Design goal:
part of a larger assembly, 2 chains, Portal protein (chain B), little secondary structure, two-stranded antiparallel sheet, 12 helices, dodecamer, about 575 residues, packaging motor, portal protein, viral protein
């Protein structure tokens, strides 16, 4: 079109490809395959050298405390018995999950294979039971190292808005899987995508298959409600307001209001900004945003081109010439032309049977005669003399062997005090909230807990008012059974499908910390050291026995919660959630 | 709501050894992210590569 904005800057990726982006594969090229760099005047055979696992391997085995099992932060918005709409939703752990490994793939992803993109549940459930109670799965993607480039937000992400770079998922000749619900006929959309595989064209394996079309771009929104200029006709009626300090009551200065903000959007359509096109419409979805977010490690960068987060290869110094041993021996075990004992072999090699090992070893015709010469000490000492007989590798072999004096010295300690938490772990906990953050901060349409909305049954209030004669109930045993039969009610009714950002329906916020799983784990801090916790006396009779249960909510023992009914009533503490039943006496 | 600042404190203290100090980013003025009674705190954060 006229403006090149999003495309022109996206031509720059291959402009630095000849420098940074084609060799940015270093992560997998040092960790696997071939680091070949400066070589000239060489022969082929080489290329399995693995010293790089020692440094990379312990970081996946580094910390078993990342899973951080934690339970139920409360708040002041809704008291714990006002949560009754969920019950055992995420109390299940997670579903039946292939993704319990996925986060473990994400914790090494700071580089690893270049940081992958995160994938969640494009559309709604195919399996449709009632009493929804919905758990979920996750996967990242592989490859996609330098092939995807992100200038978006990258710093503080709670992902309260749905802006994303590119979201559609698959790569394969079955990758056309991704649209299987959509148009899906001949796969004719014919793009041209991202083929930076360095080619002198000796051999093979280039495929053009990629599905990429941008999704949601640069959302920009303004509200500042309930203030405007109602008269004069208003060319471009809407305008901008920010500062609020000195304003006061203007109500009698003019018109009343009683107004609400209807979302006003006509977005000039560059239409999903596909360099070619998109053939289908109606991407408007429901209440808030799309639950998918990214997964992200630590961030740092400097300028136009960089190389980031060195961990794997710190030894690149000695990795080069310590393999010159191949040229020391493997070269000279080849090139040698006949180490020779020259004493009186002027004619040297004779007839075949001499070097075939025939019969017995003694030889024939070692002879000497000289024409006019004169005789002095000719001394044939030379057997080709000596190999390089390496000395400095009684020294320098250790420098290439150990740079770890500078490296592995990190985090020296055993256990107990001075824990082993490193910069790797401290940034990754904000990923685990994906099990929860995705379900909460979004507003979404009806779960339909009971009879869908059923906004009010208040109609039933009409039948009871009885002025003429009324008496208080005479002594009551018998039929009443369970209470709540309708008499007089004020229900505090209102709850709506989309309750917008308002408090009281919120669930839970970030619980991140150490590994403590809270039922009284830190009041008795076990670990490996301390011993005495709650000694005997008057306080423990009311402390450890009733309050401390390692069994959690388990129903195998119903006398857990059964202390209160017939025994302690004179003291007056109970501690159930009080769902149902009562006493007889 | 935000208990810990993940990388913001980390590079800020290391960068000043590495390079000269920079600035510190913040949301400018008011009434963009989560305006409401209560509800308002914005957590710490350094600026972008101006250092």
């Amino acid at each position: 079109e006229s403006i090149l904005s999003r495309f022109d800057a996206d031509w720059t990726a291959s402009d630095e490809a000849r420098r940074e982006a084609k060799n940015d594969l270093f992560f997998s090229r040092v960790s696997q395959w071939d680091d070949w760099l400066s070589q000239y005047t060489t022969l082929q055979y080489r290329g399995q050298f693995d010293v790089v696992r020692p440094v990379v391997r312990k970081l996946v085995s580094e910390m078993r405390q990342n899973p951080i099992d934690v339970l139920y932060r409360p708040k002041d918005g809704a008291r714990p018995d006002a949560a009754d709409v969920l019950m055992g939703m995420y109390r299940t752990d997670m579903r039946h999950n292939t993704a319990k490994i996925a986060v473990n793939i994400a914790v090494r992803e700071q580089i690893e294979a270049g940081v992958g993109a995160w994938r969640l549940v494009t559309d709604y459930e195919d399996q449709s039971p009632t009493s929804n109670n919905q758990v979920i799965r996750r996967e990242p993607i592989h490859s996609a190292c330098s092939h995807v480039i992100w200038d978006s937000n990258s710093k503080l992400m709670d992902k309260s808005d749905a802006r994303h770079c590119t979201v559609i998922h698959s790569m394969s000749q079955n990758g056309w899987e991704d649209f299987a619900e959509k148009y899906d006929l001949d796969a004719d959309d014919i793009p041209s995508f991202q083929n930076p595989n360095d080619w002198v064209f000796p051999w093979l394996t280039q495929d053009t298959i990629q599905i990429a079309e941008f999704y949601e771009v640069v959302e920009k929104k303004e509200t500042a409600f309930i203030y405007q200029d109602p008269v004069t006709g208003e060319p471009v009626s809407y305008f901008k307001r920010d500062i609020k300090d000195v304003i006061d009551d203007l109500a009698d200065s003019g018109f009343i209001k009683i107004a609400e903000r209807q979302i006003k959007r006509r977005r000039v359509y560059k239409s999903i900004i596909t360099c070619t096109a998109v053939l289908k419409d109606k991407q408007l979805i429901a209440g808030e945003h799309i639950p998918i977010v990214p997964v992200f490690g630590e961030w740092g960068f400097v300028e136009d081109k960089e190389v980031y987060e060195g961990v794997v290869r710190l030894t690149k110094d000695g990795q080069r010439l310590r393999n010159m041993i191949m040229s020391f021996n493997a070269d000279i075990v080849a090139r040698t032309p006949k180490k020779k004992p020259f004493f009186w072999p002027e004619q040297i090699a004779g007839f075949e049977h001499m070097y075939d090992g025939n019969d017995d070893y003694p030889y024939y015709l070692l002879n000497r005669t000289d024409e006019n010469s004169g005789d002095l000490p000719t001394q044939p000492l030379a057997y080709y003399e000596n190999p390089e007989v390496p000395q400095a590798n009684a020294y320098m072999l250790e420098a290439a062997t150990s740079a770890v004096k500078e490296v592995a010295t990190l985090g020296v300690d055993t256990e107990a005090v001075n824990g082993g938490q490193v910069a790797f772990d401290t940034v990754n906990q904000l990923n685990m909230r994906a099990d929860l953050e995705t379900y909460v901060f979004q507003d979404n349409l009806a779960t339909a807990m009971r009879r869908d909305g059923e906004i009010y049954q208040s109609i039933v209030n009409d039948i009871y008012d009885v002025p003429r004669n009324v008496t208080i109930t005479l002594e009551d045993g018998s039929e009443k059974d369970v209470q709540l039969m309708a008499e007089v009610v004020d229900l505090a009714t209102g709850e709506k499908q989309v309750l917008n950002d308002i408090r009281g329906r919120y669930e839970c916020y970030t619980d991140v910390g150490p590994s403590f799983q809270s039922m009284k784990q830190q009041n008795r801090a076990e670990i490996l050291e301390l011993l005495g916790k709650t000694p005997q006396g008057t306080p423990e009779y009311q402390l450890l026995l009733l309050q401390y249960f390692t069994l959690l909510d388990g129903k195998g023992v119903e006398m857990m919660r059964d202390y209160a009914n017939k025994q302690l009533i004179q003291m007056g503490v109970k501690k159930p959630e009080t769902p149902e039943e009562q006493q007889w006496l």
